[model samples]
Target: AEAWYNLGNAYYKQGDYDEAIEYYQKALELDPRSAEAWYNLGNAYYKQGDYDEAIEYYQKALELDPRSAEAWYNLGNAYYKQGDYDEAIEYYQKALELDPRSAEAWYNLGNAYYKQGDYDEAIEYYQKALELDPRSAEAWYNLGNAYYKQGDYDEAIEYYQKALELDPRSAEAWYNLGNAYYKQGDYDEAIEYYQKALELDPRSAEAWYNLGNAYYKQGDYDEAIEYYQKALELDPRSAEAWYNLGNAYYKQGDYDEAIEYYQKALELDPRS
Candidate 1:
């Protein structure tokens, strides 16, 4: 039973949530008092979006071993998903207290603080997470987001750059970096990053729409129209793409086409 619980823990660490749940359940059947088994079972439930069940199992694990940092951390995630940020923060703080060197606990604590609009506190926790594991791409990305929320575009760009260096395949990092550049009036750089994001994920409707905006900002109506068309093709319900196409048509002096696209935009989003 102990070996099976350990096996389940290994699988959970590898992100094989379903298999971990299966083995953890077996371990629990063999040894119901195995706190580690309940913890792993909670993790599997959490990954599968069953927060209530996850919280229940995590509580069970905590009853057996109050010092289980992993149980507290995972319970925090479940609480956060259920929109109980206060409870989430308490659990995350407890996890951090049990293991101050754990980057994951610090990162999740940052997320809870961020959701509660405490950007400064969030940054503090994010910095701790980064210090514990500088190579953590997610910590870098979340730090960038915290900076961005605080309106510190330069710091956001810097952290995002670090995140990109750590995980170049992160299309989300590229896309958000583009947004930061656009906010700073660096249209060319924004377009470059957006294009890089598109190269990584061509089907990203938000990326296509934003890339179109970058082109439109530079008065390259033709290129803008092309990107907007691609976005519309990928997501026909994209009101933002329709609006971008309309603007492109207007810049090209095609008033009728502009009107058509504007109507399409309105059709997709009545508020538009």
Candidate 2:
């Protein structure tokens, strides 16, 4: 009976969350005291974005086996999603105490700390997570965001590069990497990465806007206007795109076009 439950876990690991939940529930019906089955049920629910149901199963698993590290860790995730930071920290701490080498636990702890505005603690836990699993692109990307928010563009760029090296298909990583380079006045590099980001996700308005900036920096007002037009076409209500397009038209000595775009931009974002 327990072996069937283990087979369900294997399926869950392969992304068969629905089938996994069914088998897990069957396992619980056969052995009501099975803590692992309950925990696995919670995990499947968690992955499916059913936080309330996940918490119910996780708590039941915890009651059956108070020392279950995975149950505590998953319970922490549910609480974190609900914005219950204190409870999330408590459960995460319990999970960490049970298995100090859990890189995933450390990564989520860092996220909780970051959400609570404790950047120092976030960085510390992020470092610990990296020490445990150096190839985690998410960890590297998050750590870069921490650095970027603090105005350390160079360091942020370095970590963003590491993330891209690990997962080149990440549009967010490429987009943020372009921002880092732009902040440093490295417009050429910024354009290169922004183009790469657009290749991965053509619908990225931010990438289009950044590419417009790079073209503007290089004295290519016509090309900048084209990218800005594409950006606006992709996202009609993009204030940044509208504003930058107006600026590009103004540079091209097209005051009428500039004013039209400026008015649209102001309608979308008065402050911009």
Name the best candidate (by TM-score).
2
Whole-model Cα lDDT of every candidate shown, in order: 0.91, 0.90
User: Which lDDT tens digits does candidate 1 get at residues 59-87?
Assistant: 99999999998889889989999999999
RMSD of each: 4.4, 3.8
- Which candidate gets the maximum lDDT versus the true structure? 1
lDDT of 2 at 149: 73
Tens-digit per-residue lDDT, 1-272, candidate 2: 68779878888989999989888887888888988788889889999998999999999999999998989999999999999887898899999999999999998998998888877778788999999899889899999988887778998999999999989989999999999999998998999999988998998776787799899988889999999898888889888888889999999999999999999989997984
